[PDB]
Each structure stands twice: as structure tokens, then as C-alpha cells.
Amino acid sequence: SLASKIMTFCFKVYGATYLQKLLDPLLRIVITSSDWQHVSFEVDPTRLEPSESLEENQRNLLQMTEKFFHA
């Protein structure tokens, strides 16, 4: 619809810059693998790996999510 494209044009042209600035600090954190190291955020029982504890995956995923939600 035209109304959707009007919003899409505005959000895409203006929103893109706003998103990058807010996400910009996180870019250094994610690039840095010294602390993140190796982890899988999977909680699917079918795909669940016995090697990694389900509890560890759940807690890590929620903690990371909260950071984005607050921002």
C-alpha cells in the first residue's frame, strides 16, 4: 500500500542512521571474542546439544536480550 511505503521510506531513510548510532557501541563488544569466546544460544530440545547445558544457554540469551531491550 502507499501508506506502508510512505512509512517504509521514512523509517528506512531516517531510521537507519538512528539504529546505527545506538547499536554502534555494541559493535566493539560483539567483535571482541576475548570474553564471548564460544557459546550457542539454543534452547530447542530437538536441537539441544548435550555438550552445552540448557541452563547456561537460557541465562546468557536473556542477559544479552535485556541490553537491546533497554536501549
Curated annotation (Swiss-Prot):
Function: Stimulates the GTPase activity of Ras. NF1 shows greater affinity for Ras GAP, but lower specific activity. May be a regulator of Ras activity.
Disease: Neurofibromatosis 1: A disease characterized by patches of skin pigmentation (cafe-au-lait spots), Lisch nodules of the iris, tumors in the peripheral nervous system and fibromatous skin tumors. Individuals with the disorder have increased susceptibility to the development of benign and malignant tumors.
PTM: Ubiquitinated by RNF7/RBX2, leading to its degradation.
Source domain of life: Eukaryota
Subunit structure: Interacts with HTR6. Interacts with SPRED2.
Localisation: Nucleus; Nucleus, Nucleolus; Cell membrane
Protein known as: Neurofibromin
Protein's gene: NF1
Entry's free-text remark on domains: Binds phospholipids via its C-terminal CRAL-TRIO domain. Binds primarily glycerophospholipids with monounsaturated C18:1 and/or C16:1 fatty acid moieties and a phosphatidylethanolamine or phosphatidylcholine headgroup. Has lesser affinity for lipids containing phosphatidylserine and phosphatidylinositol.
Tissue-level expression: Detected in brain, peripheral nerve, lung, colon and muscle.
Source organism (scientific name): Homo sapiens (Human)
